[PDB]
Write an enzyme that holds these catalytic residues in place. Structure first.
Site, PDB file in Angstrom:
ATOM      1  N   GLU A  85       2.504  -1.155  -4.990  1.00 59.93           N
ATOM      2  CA  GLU A  85       1.200  -0.520  -5.090  1.00 59.93           C
ATOM      3  C   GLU A  85       0.394  -0.972  -6.309  1.00 59.93           C
ATOM      4  N   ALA A 141      -1.035  -2.400   4.310  1.00 57.25           N
ATOM      5  CA  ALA A 141      -1.562  -1.027   4.422  1.00 57.25           C
ATOM      6  C   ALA A 141      -2.308  -0.492   3.201  1.00 57.25           C
ATOM      7  N   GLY A 176       0.833  -1.171   0.000  1.00 56.02           N
ATOM      8  CA  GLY A 176       0.000   0.000   0.000  1.00 56.02           C
ATOM      9  C   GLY A 176       0.871   1.223   0.000  1.00 56.02           C
ATOM     10  N   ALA A 177       0.790   2.037  -1.070  1.00 51.09           N
ATOM     11  CA  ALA A 177       1.514   3.305  -1.111  1.00 51.09           C
ATOM     12  C   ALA A 177       0.686   4.563  -0.774  1.00 51.09           C
ATOM     13  N   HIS A 206      10.296  38.202   7.379  1.00 48.50           N
ATOM     14  CA  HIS A 206      11.481  37.736   6.670  1.00 48.50           C
ATOM     15  C   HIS A 206      12.575  37.542   7.726  1.00 48.50           C
ATOM     16  N   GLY A 237      -5.784  -0.374   3.222  1.00 45.15           N
ATOM     17  CA  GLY A 237      -6.938   0.431   3.411  1.00 45.15           C
ATOM     18  C   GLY A 237      -7.438   0.373   4.826  1.00 45.15           C
ATOM     19  N   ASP A 266     -15.004   8.260  10.654  1.00 38.62           N
ATOM     20  CA  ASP A 266     -14.653   7.133   9.793  1.00 38.62           C
ATOM     21  C   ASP A 266     -15.669   6.125   9.382  1.00 38.62           C
TER      22      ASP A 266
HETATM   23  C1  FAD Z   1      22.328  40.926  13.642  1.00 40.97           C
HETATM   24  C2  FAD Z   1      21.179  41.413  12.829  1.00 40.97           C
HETATM   25  C3  FAD Z   1      20.134  40.543  12.623  1.00 40.97           C
HETATM   26  C4  FAD Z   1      18.974  40.957  12.004  1.00 40.97           C
HETATM   27  N1  FAD Z   1      17.960  40.087  11.825  1.00 40.97           N
HETATM   28  C5  FAD Z   1      16.852  40.449  11.123  1.00 40.97           C
HETATM   29  C6  FAD Z   1      15.845  39.529  10.822  1.00 40.97           C
HETATM   30  O1  FAD Z   1      15.895  38.399  11.263  1.00 40.97           O
HETATM   31  N2  FAD Z   1      14.643  40.017  10.276  1.00 40.97           N
HETATM   32  C7  FAD Z   1      14.516  41.365   9.962  1.00 40.97           C
HETATM   33  O2  FAD Z   1      13.498  41.804   9.460  1.00 40.97           O
HETATM   34  N3  FAD Z   1      15.522  42.190  10.205  1.00 40.97           N
HETATM   35  C8  FAD Z   1      16.694  41.757  10.688  1.00 40.97           C
HETATM   36  N4  FAD Z   1      17.715  42.669  10.831  1.00 40.97           N
HETATM   37  C9  FAD Z   1      17.672  43.903  10.196  1.00 40.97           C
HETATM   38  C10 FAD Z   1      17.993  44.074   8.727  1.00 40.97           C
HETATM   39  O3  FAD Z   1      19.390  43.819   8.553  1.00 40.97           O
HETATM   40  C11 FAD Z   1      17.564  45.520   8.387  1.00 40.97           C
HETATM   41  O4  FAD Z   1      16.228  45.771   8.853  1.00 40.97           O
HETATM   42  C12 FAD Z   1      17.567  45.749   6.859  1.00 40.97           C
HETATM   43  O5  FAD Z   1      18.870  45.449   6.362  1.00 40.97           O
HETATM   44  C13 FAD Z   1      17.243  47.192   6.456  1.00 40.97           C
HETATM   45  O6  FAD Z   1      17.234  47.345   5.027  1.00 40.97           O
HETATM   46  P1  FAD Z   1      17.451  48.616   4.464  1.00 40.97           P
HETATM   47  O7  FAD Z   1      17.284  48.288   3.021  1.00 40.97           O
HETATM   48  O8  FAD Z   1      16.709  49.764   5.044  1.00 40.97           O
HETATM   49  O9  FAD Z   1      19.007  48.758   4.805  1.00 40.97           O
HETATM   50  P2  FAD Z   1      20.337  47.851   4.747  1.00 40.97           P
HETATM   51  O10 FAD Z   1      20.037  46.404   4.701  1.00 40.97           O
HETATM   52  O11 FAD Z   1      21.240  48.335   5.792  1.00 40.97           O
HETATM   53  O12 FAD Z   1      20.925  48.204   3.313  1.00 40.97           O
HETATM   54  C14 FAD Z   1      21.455  49.494   3.126  1.00 40.97           C
HETATM   55  C15 FAD Z   1      22.373  49.450   1.938  1.00 40.97           C
HETATM   56  O13 FAD Z   1      22.614  50.814   1.505  1.00 40.97           O
HETATM   57  C16 FAD Z   1      23.978  50.860   1.046  1.00 40.97           C
HETATM   58  N5  FAD Z   1      24.490  52.248   0.976  1.00 40.97           N
HETATM   59  C17 FAD Z   1      24.546  53.150   1.968  1.00 40.97           C
HETATM   60  N6  FAD Z   1      24.979  54.344   1.525  1.00 40.97           N
HETATM   61  C18 FAD Z   1      25.189  54.146   0.237  1.00 40.97           C
HETATM   62  C19 FAD Z   1      25.624  55.122  -0.630  1.00 40.97           C
HETATM   63  N7  FAD Z   1      25.667  56.402  -0.276  1.00 40.97           N
HETATM   64  N8  FAD Z   1      25.728  54.753  -1.900  1.00 40.97           N
HETATM   65  C20 FAD Z   1      25.435  53.521  -2.285  1.00 40.97           C
HETATM   66  N9  FAD Z   1      25.057  52.575  -1.430  1.00 40.97           N
HETATM   67  C21 FAD Z   1      24.899  52.865  -0.135  1.00 40.97           C
HETATM   68  C22 FAD Z   1      24.692  49.964   2.036  1.00 40.97           C
HETATM   69  O14 FAD Z   1      25.967  49.532   1.547  1.00 40.97           O
HETATM   70  C23 FAD Z   1      23.702  48.853   2.348  1.00 40.97           C
HETATM   71  O15 FAD Z   1      23.957  47.614   1.667  1.00 40.97           O
HETATM   72  C24 FAD Z   1      18.905  42.258  11.463  1.00 40.97           C
HETATM   73  C25 FAD Z   1      19.961  43.134  11.659  1.00 40.97           C
HETATM   74  C26 FAD Z   1      21.086  42.739  12.373  1.00 40.97           C
HETATM   75  C27 FAD Z   1      22.243  43.710  12.469  1.00 40.97           C
HETATM   76  C1  FAD Z   2      -1.301   4.815  11.395  1.00 40.36           C
HETATM   77  C2  FAD Z   2      -2.422   5.852  11.192  1.00 40.36           C
HETATM   78  C3  FAD Z   2      -2.047   7.157  11.115  1.00 40.36           C
HETATM   79  C4  FAD Z   2      -2.989   8.153  11.028  1.00 40.36           C
HETATM   80  N1  FAD Z   2      -2.538   9.427  11.010  1.00 40.36           N
HETATM   81  C5  FAD Z   2      -3.386  10.438  10.965  1.00 40.36           C
HETATM   82  C6  FAD Z   2      -2.952  11.753  11.025  1.00 40.36           C
HETATM   83  O1  FAD Z   2      -1.783  12.020  11.263  1.00 40.36           O
HETATM   84  N2  FAD Z   2      -3.936  12.764  10.940  1.00 40.36           N
HETATM   85  C7  FAD Z   2      -5.255  12.399  10.663  1.00 40.36           C
HETATM   86  O2  FAD Z   2      -6.114  13.200  10.610  1.00 40.36           O
HETATM   87  N3  FAD Z   2      -5.624  11.132  10.602  1.00 40.36           N
HETATM   88  C8  FAD Z   2      -4.748  10.166  10.731  1.00 40.36           C
HETATM   89  N4  FAD Z   2      -5.250   8.892  10.778  1.00 40.36           N
HETATM   90  C9  FAD Z   2      -6.774   8.759  10.641  1.00 40.36           C
HETATM   91  C10 FAD Z   2      -7.170   8.805  11.891  1.00 40.36           C
HETATM   92  O3  FAD Z   2      -6.518   8.261  13.036  1.00 40.36           O
HETATM   93  C11 FAD Z   2      -8.687   8.493  11.829  1.00 40.36           C
HETATM   94  O4  FAD Z   2      -9.270   9.226  10.751  1.00 40.36           O
HETATM   95  C12 FAD Z   2      -9.454   8.942  13.067  1.00 40.36           C
HETATM   96  O5  FAD Z   2      -8.984   8.100  14.118  1.00 40.36           O
HETATM   97  C13 FAD Z   2     -10.986   8.826  12.939  1.00 40.36           C
HETATM   98  O6  FAD Z   2     -11.580   8.774  14.240  1.00 40.36           O
HETATM   99  P1  FAD Z   2     -13.080   8.246  14.638  1.00 40.36           P
HETATM  100  O7  FAD Z   2     -13.521   9.007  15.834  1.00 40.36           O
HETATM  101  O8  FAD Z   2     -13.962   8.248  13.448  1.00 40.36           O
HETATM  102  O9  FAD Z   2     -12.784   6.716  14.915  1.00 40.36           O
HETATM  103  P2  FAD Z   2     -11.771   5.907  15.779  1.00 40.36           P
HETATM  104  O10 FAD Z   2     -10.580   6.721  16.117  1.00 40.36           O
HETATM  105  O11 FAD Z   2     -11.505   4.649  15.097  1.00 40.36           O
HETATM  106  O12 FAD Z   2     -12.441   5.713  17.193  1.00 40.36           O
HETATM  107  C14 FAD Z   2     -13.650   4.977  17.337  1.00 40.36           C
HETATM  108  C15 FAD Z   2     -13.711   4.480  18.766  1.00 40.36           C
HETATM  109  O13 FAD Z   2     -15.024   3.928  19.003  1.00 40.36           O
HETATM  110  C16 FAD Z   2     -14.805   2.716  19.769  1.00 40.36           C
HETATM  111  N5  FAD Z   2     -15.833   1.667  19.626  1.00 40.36           N
HETATM  112  C17 FAD Z   2     -16.221   1.092  18.463  1.00 40.36           C
HETATM  113  N6  FAD Z   2     -17.408   0.474  18.622  1.00 40.36           N
HETATM  114  C18 FAD Z   2     -17.676   0.656  19.915  1.00 40.36           C
HETATM  115  C19 FAD Z   2     -18.808   0.171  20.520  1.00 40.36           C
HETATM  116  N7  FAD Z   2     -19.702  -0.502  19.820  1.00 40.36           N
HETATM  117  N8  FAD Z   2     -18.914   0.445  21.833  1.00 40.36           N
HETATM  118  C20 FAD Z   2     -17.975   1.134  22.473  1.00 40.36           C
HETATM  119  N9  FAD Z   2     -16.875   1.616  21.896  1.00 40.36           N
HETATM  120  C21 FAD Z   2     -16.712   1.382  20.583  1.00 40.36           C
HETATM  121  C22 FAD Z   2     -13.486   2.139  19.326  1.00 40.36           C
HETATM  122  O14 FAD Z   2     -12.908   1.339  20.375  1.00 40.36           O
HETATM  123  C23 FAD Z   2     -12.667   3.380  18.986  1.00 40.36           C
HETATM  124  O15 FAD Z   2     -11.759   3.647  20.050  1.00 40.36           O
HETATM  125  C24 FAD Z   2      -4.350   7.852  10.991  1.00 40.36           C
HETATM  126  C25 FAD Z   2      -4.766   6.541  11.135  1.00 40.36           C
HETATM  127  C26 FAD Z   2      -3.790   5.545  11.292  1.00 40.36           C
HETATM  128  C27 FAD Z   2      -4.255   4.099  11.495  1.00 40.36           C
END
Ligand code: FAD
Ligand code: FAD
EC number: 1.8.1.4
Lengths: 472, 472
Positions: free
Chosen positions: A210, A275, A187-188, A450, A277, A318
Site C-alpha cells: 500500500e 486494486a 491496494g489495501a 440476552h 481505485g 459512482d
Molecule cells: C434451558 C433454558 C434456556 C433459557 N434460555 C434463555 C435465553 O436464551 N434468554 C433468556 O432471556 N432466558 C433464557 N432462559 C431463562 C433464564 O434462565 C431465566 O429467565 C433467568 O435465569 C431468571 O433470572 P432470575 O434472576 O429471575 O433467576 P435465576 O437465573 O433462576 O437465578 C435465581 C438465583 O437465586 C438463587 N437462590 C434461590 N434461593 C436462594 C436463597 N434462598 N438464598 C440464596 N440464593 C438463592 C438461585 O441459586 C439462583 O442462582 C432459559 C432458561 C432455561 C431453563
Molecule cells: C469488488 C467490488 C466490491 C464491492 N462491494 C460493495 C459492497 O459490498 N457494498 C457496496 O455498497 N459497494 C460495493 N462496491 C461498490 C459498488 O459495487 C458500487 O458503488 C456500485 O456498483 C455503484 O453503482 P452505480 O449505479 O453508480 O454504477 P454501476 O454499478 O457501475 O452501474 C452502471 C451501469 O451503467 C451502465 N452503462 C454505462 N454507460 C452506459 C451507457 N452509456 N449506456 C448504457 N449503459 C451504460 C454500465 O454497463 C453499468 O452496468 C463494490 C465494488 C466492487 C468492484
C-alpha cells in the site's frame, strides 16, 4: 412512447432503483443498459450485482466455511476428513447467485412496467438520448428528464498493466479457477482486503502493498489498528508504504519491484490483483453536450440534489461525488426520482454506513474519533469487547469491540463504529437511532435481548458515562 | 451484623445485575447465593449462566456447524470426509464457557464492591435477612432495603418423573454424553424445541409432544406457521394435542403412553425431556411471615414497579409477573436499584424482545397480528422474504421473512417479527425504531447498507406503504 418522463442510462443499483421508483411514482420511464453478462444476454444491476458486491460476499462466505472446518471445528468436537476446496464449484455457485439475482431485477422492471432499451445511450442537446444497439442501430428518444447512472471502473496503473490472466483487476480475481500459490494485491482498500482474505483462507500466501502512510485512513483509528492486527494474524502481509515501480512477467508469474525500507522485489507472484481505485466512466455518455460539466478529476458536476448544469438532467452514484457505495447510489436514485415527481426530498450524507466483510466485519456510521479531534468537538467514548459477550463466547467468536462516541455536552451520539461478529447489523442499529438524534443514555436505557450480539452496543452506550455492568 | 443498604437474595441475571447497579449508585449492597456449580464452589449467574441461556446457545452453535458440514459444504465445493461428532468434547467446551463466564460475574461483583454471602438467605419479619452457611452457622444481617431475586425451577409432571438418567429436564438434556437415537420432548415451547433441535441435528429422531394444539401461541401466527413447517422439515416431529398419560421406565427406554384424539403410545424413546414450564421458587424465604404476599399461582405480588407489600422490599425476575426472560429480570434489577437510590427510573414492559435461537432463529417485539385483529385495530403489514435478499443468497441462508406491522391510521409501528438469519438483531433494530415512535415510513426513508440482512427490514417497512423495491 416517443416521449418519456425519465430516461435512465445505466442499470446499476443507482440506475435500476432510479427506474423502479420513477415508474412507482407513475412516470413513463425508460432504462438504457449495455452490459451483457456471462451467459450472453444483458445483465442488469451493474458492477454490484455482476462483478462486485454479490460476487465478493459470496466467495467470502464460501472461503469462511472452509476456514472454520479447517481451524475450529475441533473445538466443537466435530471431526471431518481432510477438507479440500473445489474452486470451479465455488465459482459456479457464485455464478448461479448472480444468474438468479440478475433475473430477479429483470422481472422487477417488467412487472413495474419500465421499458428497457438494450444498447449504449448518450445524451444529446435538448435531452434526447441516442441508443445504439449491438449492430450499430441508432435511435433517439425524447424525454422530459435524464438520469445518468453510468458508474465507475478500475483505475489503471502504468507499472502493472492488466491482461486478465497473470495480472488482474477485481473482476479477473473473482473468477480464478484454482487458488494461486502467491498472490500480490496492490491496494489495501476495501476491495483489496476482501479479495486478499478470500484466497488467503483457501491457500494463497498474500502480500498487500500500500502506498499511503496509513492503514485504512477513513475507518476509526482504534478499529483500524485492531483490524491490521487481526488481518495480519490470518496472514495477510500488509506492507504499508510501498511504491511499485515496475513489473515483469517471464511467461507465467510476475516479479514486482517496489520501495519500502529497502528497494525490494517480490518473487514473482502467480497472480497480481490491481486494486488501487475505481474512477468514473464518461465514455461516450454525452455529446459536446446538453451542457453537462465534468470536474478536474472526471466526475459529473451535480449540486447537492444530484441535478446537473442542464435543467432536468441528474447524475447519481459512482460518477458523482460522495462515497462510492451501492446504498449511496440507490438512495441518490429514489431521492432524485422524488424530486422529479413529488419533490420534497434531500439525502443525508452524514449517515451512510461503510462495511468491509472480512473475518470479523469492520463497519461504522457517523464520524470517526480522529475527525472529531480535527475540529475539536470534545467527545466522550465508551467501548465494549466481544470477549465479554456470553453470546459471542457461545458462538466461539470473540474478536473485536463496539465503539460509541458522543458529544461530551449533552451526549448526542456522534459515531458508532465496530469490528466484530455482525458489525453491519449493529452499526445499522447505531445508525437508526442516530437518525432519531439519540444520546448514549437513550441507548443504555433500552431493553436488549440476552444473549444477543446487540448487547455489546448497549454496553458501549452505558460505558460513555462510565456505567457498564459487565466490565465497569 | 454488618448493616447494609440493599441485600439481594439470589445471584441470577436479575439479582447479580441489581447488586452491581446498587453498588454503582452508592449503596452498600450484599449478594446472597447458594448455587454450587458442577466443579464445587458457589457459582453466580443463575439458571441462565449455569443451566439455561448460555448452555443452550453454546450447544445450539456446535450442532448447527455439524448440521452445516454434513449437508451444506458440498454447495461451495468443500470436499470433506463425512462429518463425525464427539459429544464428550462438545459438552466440555460448553462447560468451559460457563466456567469462564461464572468466573467473570464473580470478578465483576468484587470489582463493583458487592459483599457476597455464600449460603441460603431467608427473609425474616422486619427486613432482616438470615444466611445459613454450609454447616448451619446462622447470621442475621440488617439492611433498609431487600431485593428477592430467587428464581424459577422446572415444572415436574406426575405421568413422568425426572430421575436425570432416563427421564430428564432441561438441565440434564444439557449434559448428555451421547446422542439418543430416539428422543421425546414434552413441551413444544422455546426450551423444548431448542433442546430438541440440538440433538435432532446431531442425529436423534425426535418427537415433541404438546398438550395444546396451538403451536407457539405468543408468537405471530404467520411466523409460527412458517416455523412449524421449516422445523418439521429438519426432522422434528411435533405432535400437537398430545397429553401423556403414563411412563414406563424399563432399563433401556421410556415407553410413553399418550392420548391425542386417539389413545396411543409412541415407542419407547431412549430419553425423555420434560420441558413443560418453569415455576417460581419461594421455598424458604418467608420466616413465618416476612410480610410478603404470595400470589395465587406461586409468584410474589409486586406492583408495576416491583414493590411488594413490605415497604423496603422488592422482587424481580421469574419469581414475579412477566415474561420469564433474562433481559426482563436484568432490567427490573436496574430499575429497582435506581428507585431505591432516588426514584429516577421506569421500564417499558411493552417492548421486551423474545427470541427462539432455532435453525432459522425466530424473534418478535410489540403486538402480534392476531392480537391486533382480536382487539379490532386496523393495520397494514409489509412482509419481505430472505429469498429476495442479496446477502441471504450469498450466505446460503435464505429461509423465512421480516414482517412489519404498523397501525393503518397513523403509520406507527406496532410489532416487528422475523423468522430468518439474525432475527434477534433485526428485531432489536425494530425495538430501537419503536422506542423512538417510528412510522413505517421513517424506517423506509433510512439508508440501509448493501448487501445486508438489515435491508430485509427496510424493504418490509417500505412494503407496509405499498412501495418495496424488490418484490411488489
Ligand atoms: C434451558 C433454558 C434456556 C433459557 N434460555 C434463555 C435465553 O436464551 N434468554 C433468556 O432471556 N432466558 C433464557 N432462559 C431463562 C433464564 O434462565 C431465566 O429467565 C433467568 O435465569 C431468571 O433470572 P432470575 O434472576 O429471575 O433467576 P435465576 O437465573 O433462576 O437465578 C435465581 C438465583 O437465586 C438463587 N437462590 C434461590 N434461593 C436462594 C436463597 N434462598 N438464598 C440464596 N440464593 C438463592 C438461585 O441459586 C439462583 O442462582 C432459559 C432458561 C432455561 C431453563
Ligand atoms: C469488488 C467490488 C466490491 C464491492 N462491494 C460493495 C459492497 O459490498 N457494498 C457496496 O455498497 N459497494 C460495493 N462496491 C461498490 C459498488 O459495487 C458500487 O458503488 C456500485 O456498483 C455503484 O453503482 P452505480 O449505479 O453508480 O454504477 P454501476 O454499478 O457501475 O452501474 C452502471 C451501469 O451503467 C451502465 N452503462 C454505462 N454507460 C452506459 C451507457 N452509456 N449506456 C448504457 N449503459 C451504460 C454500465 O454497463 C453499468 O452496468 C463494490 C465494488 C466492487 C468492484
Amino acid at each position: 412512447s416517443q416521449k418519456f418522463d425519465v430516461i435512465v442510462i445505466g442499470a446499476g443499483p443507482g440506475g435500476y432503483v432510479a427506474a423502479i421508483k420513477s415508474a412507482q411514482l407513475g412516470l413513463k420511464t425508460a432504462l438504457i443498459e449495455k452490459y451483457k453478462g456471462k451467459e450472453g444476454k444483458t445483465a442488469l444491476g451493474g458492477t454490484c450485482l455482476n462483478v462486485g458486491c454479490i460476487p465478493s460476499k459470496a466467495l467470502l462466505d464460501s472461503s469462511y466455511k472452509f476456514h472454520e472446518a479447517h481451524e475450529s471445528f475441533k473445538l466443537h468436537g466435530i471431526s471431518t476428513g481432510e477438507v479440500a476446496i473445489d474452486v470451479p464449484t465455488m465459482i459456479a455457485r457464485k455464478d448461479q447467485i448472480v444468474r438468479n439475482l440478475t433475473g430477479g431485477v429483470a422481472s422487477l422492471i417488467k412487472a413495474n412496467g419500465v421499458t428497457l432499451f438494450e444498447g449504449h445511450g448518450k445524451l444529446l442537446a435538448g435531452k434526447k438520448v441516442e441508443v445504439t444497439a449491438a449492430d450499430g442501430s441508432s435511435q433517439v428518444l425524447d424525454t422530459e428528464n435524464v438520469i445518468l447512472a453510468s458508474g465507475s471502473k478500475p483505475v489503471e496503473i502504468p507499472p502493472a498493466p492488466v491482461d486478465q490472466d497473470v495480472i488482474v483487476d477485481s473482476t479477473g480475481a473473482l473468477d480464478f479457477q484454482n487458488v494461486p500459490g502467491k498472490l500480490g494485491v496492490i491496494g489495501a482498500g476495501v476491495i483489496g482486503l476482501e479479495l486478499g482474505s478470500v484466497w488467503a483462507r483457501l491457500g494463497a500466501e498474500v502480500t498487500v502493498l500500500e502506498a499511503m502512510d496509513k492503514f485504512l485512513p477513513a475507518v476509526d483509528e482504534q478499529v483500524a489498528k485492531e483490524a491490521q492486527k487481526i488481518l495480519t494474524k490470518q496472514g495477510l502481509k500488509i506492507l504499508l508504504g510501498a511504491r511499485v515501480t515496475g513489473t515483469e512477467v517471464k511467461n507465467k508469474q510476475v516479479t514486482v519491484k517496489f520501495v519500502d525500507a529497502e528497494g525490494e522485489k517480490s518473487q514473482a507472484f502467480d497472480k497480481l490483483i490491481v486494486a488501487v481505485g475505481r474512477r468514473p466512466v464518461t465514455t461516450d455518455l454525452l455529446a459536446a453536450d446538453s451542457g453537462v460539466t465534468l470536474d478536474e478529476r472526471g466526475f459529473i458536476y451535480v449540486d447537492d440534489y444530484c441535478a446537473t448544469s442542464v435543467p432536468g438532467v441528474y447524475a447519481i452514484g459512482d460518477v458523482v461525488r460522495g462515497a462510492m457505495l451501492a446504498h449511496k447510489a440507490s438512495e441518490e436514485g429514489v431521492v432524485v426520482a422524488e424530486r422529479i415527481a413529488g419533490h420534497k426530498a434531500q439525502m443525508n450524507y452524514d449517515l451512510i454506513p461503510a462495511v468491509i466483510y472480512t473475518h470479523p466485519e469492520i463497519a461504522g456510521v457517523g464520524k470517526t474519533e480522529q475527525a472529531l479531534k480535527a475540529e475539536g468537538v470534545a467527545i466522550n467514548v465508551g467501548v465494549f469487547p466481544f470477549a465479554a459477550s456470553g453470546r459471542a463466547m457461545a458462538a466461539n467468536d470473540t474478536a473485536g469491540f463496539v465503539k460509541v462516541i458522543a458529544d461530551a455536552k449533552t451526549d448526542r451520539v456522534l459515531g458508532v463504529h465496530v469490528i466484530g461478529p455482525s458489525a453491519a447489523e449493529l452499526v445499522q442499529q447505531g445508525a437508526i437511532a442516530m437518525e432519531f438524534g439519540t444520546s448514549a443514555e437513550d441507548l443504555g436505557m433500552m431493553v436488549f435481548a440476552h444473549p444477543a450480539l446487540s448487547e455489546a452496543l448497549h454496553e458501549a452506550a452505558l460505558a460513555v458515562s462510565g456505567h457498564a455492568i459487565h466490565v465497569a
